[PDB]
RNA sequence: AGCCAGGAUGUUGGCUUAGAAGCAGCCAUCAUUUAAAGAAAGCGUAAUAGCUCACUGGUCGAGUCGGCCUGCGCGGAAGA
RNA sequence: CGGCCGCAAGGUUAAAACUCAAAUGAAUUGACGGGGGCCCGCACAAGCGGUGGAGCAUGUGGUUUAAUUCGAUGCAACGCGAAGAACCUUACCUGGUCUUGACAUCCACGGAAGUUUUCAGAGAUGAGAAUGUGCCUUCGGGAACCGUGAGACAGGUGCUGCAUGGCUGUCGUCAGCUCGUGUUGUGAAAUGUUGGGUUAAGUCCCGCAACGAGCGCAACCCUUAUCCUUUGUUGCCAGCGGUCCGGCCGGGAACUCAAAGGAGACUGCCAGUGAUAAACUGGAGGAAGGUGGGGAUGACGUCAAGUCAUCAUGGCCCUUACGACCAGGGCUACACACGUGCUACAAUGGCGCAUACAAAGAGAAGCGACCUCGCGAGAGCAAGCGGACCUCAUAAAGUGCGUCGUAGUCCGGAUUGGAGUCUGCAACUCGACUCCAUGAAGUCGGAAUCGCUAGUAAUCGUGGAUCAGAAUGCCACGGUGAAUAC
RNA sequence: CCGCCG
RNA sequence: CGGUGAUUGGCGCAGCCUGGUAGCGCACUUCGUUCGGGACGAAGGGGUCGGAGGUUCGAAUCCUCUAUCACCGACCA
């Protein structure tokens, strides 16, 4: 009731212990340390303001490991006290003192893990059957179960936006949105094919069925925040209009030039038998071309997103969901495996996305 | 108004920081000597440092310096 | 593509890269056909009663959970393993504990073992405190266990039934499946096994490049239906005597019955049909007539079907833990879906009173008369019985009378409150039964679907296994008892 | 009469 | 720009015009059929009518603007 939360937060600094390798980081401290006692380095300003930079970077880290487990230890020798002389009223202070450890503790944890920038939005999943009949659907039903029971224990909301059923059995495709605060933060660890060993029931003769399903998981933005541009020079241009069979040619100009100085933006209005009326109409064009450009970047920006690590060989396959022989699940990035796949399948992918976010930190 | 001095205390404190010291900040934002001095108003320093300012004494030899109401002017004020 | 020809459509002549390791022909065996012939099976038809609607019981899927252990999961999983989960079982979860260990063998050491009582603890455990200290004798010394230490090991309901054995389902109790030798074909193969009849049957007869054989079919086995011989109890009472009229007692061995041993039924006989055949139809007789009824009996194989969780087992893997011990919980959750059942919706019925007729089985920490007490479940005292003797044990539908008079009603009996009984350390999660009170849906069930050919369906009660307690399931038993098959 | 697929 | 006519289930359309009274087909859900899938049956759910404000006891419907959508005209010099 105390000591379980002692013995599990032990298991959970080592994570960091090995996740940020202190022995590099205090190894790099002092040799920083050691060289900025020279003015010579703090002279020219434009090396020291990121050394600076860079050495309190660092100190956060080592300070905060520290002192977590120096909190730790004195909670320790507390609780030790407590099981070794029964104080009951240092067990009621014990207890509050663990809950603001843990407040201190998985508050560290999502500052160290979470500072990438779409780590805040909704997870965009999406779950491709990979290739084949209806053993590859049905593992696609199967992850679609898995991530669900998990968005909901995590207490998230899973909205499912596009669906599409399978044949005899499973699903053909599935687009979810999970919102949720740090949803793509966690759901970075999915990104991947996800491979199955199992004897398939759709089958007759048990052969051993190895599928694979393709997970893209994108952040969503939905921002929609975009009014005018005029804080630069929009420089316009009225003059006269290409065109015969009137009187614009030989009397007045009508026709509307607009340039800007983002992208170079140029747009023409000149069919409306009055200027202002073109003006109008090439704001209108204005925006129905700084919108599209703005869905442009946006959609160049998420192909950077879907095509980062879209080049190793057999990396790109996590996730070995061992079923028939031997039943375990294993991943193929950080080397960690748990040998109960019903939990798994039930939902607690937790440790495998902690693991994950706990390897690319380092 | 000038000119000459002084313009100092426990004192660098609890923090953002290897250190934030009267002036990048948020609190404490005061007790001493006096004729007076703000754990300081400004420049300046990575910060300290320097430099002035408030304020206070000496020469000086009398009117000064701001705010309101008004009269008349000034700039704003470039075309074939 | 180029040439020639053509009004055109196009014809004729005619490549290459690339691509694959085959494409193709004829024949053989199977399988398949919305090809053909013949035949069959509750297959359809002819009927009867259901399921799907309702409420509950049980199992599964999902969902939930700390865990809802694991397995089967078209037919051929889903009242299945489980012939019975409160603790145990229990394999699962949470917490507390142990490590050569709960269970084995070996080594060394100390003590007989054993019995009683207290403290702490949820208990496992640890601390104790007394009694005891048997038979050997090399009587330092052993058989017996206890306790400790060390390690070979032990342990695993951990994995793989797609490494296996054994056991099982299945097509299917369907009538097939093969072989030896011979002959035929270059060969795969074929023939036998096909054909005419016939049969429940590759059953039999006849023919025939086949001749034979084997596993199957049939019979041999159990049971049931009739009779006879023996024996006559704790079973029976036909004839005599008494009877308190109860086979109750003398008696009897008749009969029912009990069991052992035989007989009987084989198309045997008759007639007709049919190849002078097998057989088929009909009749006599007989208790039974054409394998009399029912069972057991499961061919070569099929499904890499099921089970490594009954056991055994090759190989992996854990080994101060995936092993071991305990307490509590869970296996019984509940927006929902399915399977299999029980109870109903009533008048061919409900209730009240009276009254008749069974079979089969179980029983010694067991079945438990009588009598008393209790409305009752039951309780007390307590016979008899290791059982043709005693007990479970009243069969109920049935019949006679009365009443209800078609209403959600004297139908239904779920749900819930209160009071209890018993089992078991313990009935909260979660037992069964009783009493009082309550009185839900339900007024005959959509598409769809199931079983059954005669003592069958339908309905009615009884008993057993498992089991301290805990069947609406399972396995057996008798009562009444059809409709229909052109 | 209608009877597609694996 | 105005003129003119529409926004009803997840989709395509009704209903509006006449003030009370939202349905059709597909699609979805469950059950059935099937070895399974489709097809086919049998049950069941489905929107508070673009937004806002008035008329009235009452508005999806009658007006009023605001948004969106499509058609028509935007002329002569």
Same mark, same amino acid.
């Given at each position: 009731?105390?000591?379980?939360?002692?013995?599990?937060?032990?298991?959970?600094?080592?994570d960091?212990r090995?996740?940020?390798?202190?022995?590099?980081?205090?190894?790099?401290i002092?040799?920083?340390?050691?060289?900025?006692?020279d003015?010579?380095?703090?002279?020219?300003?434009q090396?020291a303001? &990121?050394?600076?930079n @860079?050495?309190? !970077?660092? +100190?956060?880290?080592?300070?905060? $490991?520290?002192?977590?487990? *120096?909190?730790?230890?004195?909670?320790?020798?507390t609780?030790d006290?407590?099981?070794?002389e029964?104080?009951?009223?240092?067990?009621?202070?014990?207890?509050?003192?663990?809950?603001?450890?843990?407040?201190?503790?998985?508050?560290?944890?999502?500052?160290?893990?979470?500072?990438?920038?779409?780590?805040?939005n909704?997870?965009?999943?999406?779950?491709?059957?990979?290739?084949?009949?209806?053993?590859?659907?049905?593992?696609?039903?199967?992850?679609?179960?898995?991530? &669900?029971?998990?968005? @909901?224990?995590? !207490?998230f +909301?899973?909205?499912t936006?596009? $669906?599409l059923?399978?044949? *005899?059995?499973?699903?053909?495709?599935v687009?979810?949105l999970?919102?949720?605060?740090?949803?793509y933060?966690?759901?970075?660890?999915?990104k991947?094919?996800?491979?199955?060993?199992?004897?398939?029931?759709?089958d007759?003769?048990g052969?051993r069925?190895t599928?694979?399903?393709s997970?893209?998981?994108?952040?969503?933005?939905?921002?929609e925040?975009?009014?005018?541009?005029?804080?630069?020079?929009?420089?316009?241009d009225?003059?006269?209009?290409?065109?015969?069979?009137?009187?614009?040619?030989?009397?007045?100009?009508?026709?509307?030039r607009?340039?800007?100085?983002?992208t170079?933006?140029?747009?023409?209005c000149?069919?409306e038998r009055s200027?202002?009326?073109?003006?109008?109409?090439?704001?209108?064009?204005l925006?129905?071309?700084?919108?599209?450009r703005?869905?442009?970047?946006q959609?160049?920006?998420?192909?950077?997103?879907?095509?980062?690590?879209?080049?190793?060989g057999?990396?790109?396959?996590?996730?070995?969901?061992?079923?028939?022989?031997?039943?375990?699940?294993?991943?193929?990035?950080?080397?960690?495996?748990?040998?109960?796949?019903?939990?798994?399948?039930?939902?607690d992918?937790?440790?495998?996305?902690?693991?994950?976010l706990?390897?690319?930190?380092?």
């Amino acid at each position: 009731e105390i000591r379980a939360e002692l013995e599990n937060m032990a298991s959970r600094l080592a994570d960091f212990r090995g996740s940020l390798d202190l022995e590099s980081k205090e190894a790099r401290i002092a040799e920083l340390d050691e060289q900025m006692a020279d003015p010579e380095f703090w002279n020219d300003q434009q090396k020291a303001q &990121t050394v600076i930079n @860079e050495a309190n !970077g660092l +100190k956060d880290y080592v300070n905060s $490991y520290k002192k977590l487990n *120096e909190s730790h230890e004195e909670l320790q020798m507390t609780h030790d006290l407590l099981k070794e002389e029964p104080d009951t009223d240092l067990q009621l202070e014990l207890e509050k003192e663990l809950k603001s450890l843990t407040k201190e503790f998985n508050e560290f944890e999502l500052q160290l893990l979470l500072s990438e920038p779409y780590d805040k939005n909704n997870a965009i999943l999406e779950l491709h059957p990979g290739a084949g009949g209806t053993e590859s659907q049905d593992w696609g039903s199967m992850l679609l179960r898995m991530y &669900t029971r998990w968005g @909901e224990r995590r !207490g998230f +909301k899973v909205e499912t936006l596009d $669906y599409l059923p399978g044949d *005899e059995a499973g699903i053909k495709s599935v687009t979810l949105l999970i919102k949720g605060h740090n949803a793509y933060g966690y759901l970075k660890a999915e990104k991947g094919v996800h491979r199955l060993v199992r004897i398939s029931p759709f089958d007759s003769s048990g052969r051993r069925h190895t599928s694979f399903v393709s997970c893209e998981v994108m952040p969503e933005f939905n921002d929609e925040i975009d009014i005018d541009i005029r804080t630069e020079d929009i420089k316009v241009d009225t003059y006269r209009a290409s065109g015969a069979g009137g009187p614009h040619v030989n009397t007045t100009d009508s026709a509307v030039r607009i340039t800007h100085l983002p992208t170079n933006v140029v747009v023409t209005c000149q069919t409306e038998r009055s200027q202002i009326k073109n003006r109008e109409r090439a704001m209108k064009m204005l925006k129905a071309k700084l919108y599209q450009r703005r869905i442009e970047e946006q959609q160049a920006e998420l192909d950077e997103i879907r095509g980062e690590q879209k080049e190793i060989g057999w990396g790109s396959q996590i996730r070995s969901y061992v079923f028939h022989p031997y039943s375990m699940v294993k991943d193929h990035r950080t080397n960690t495996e748990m040998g109960n796949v019903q939990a798994v399948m039930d939902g607690d992918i937790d440790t495998f996305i902690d693991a994950y976010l706990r390897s690319k930190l380092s």
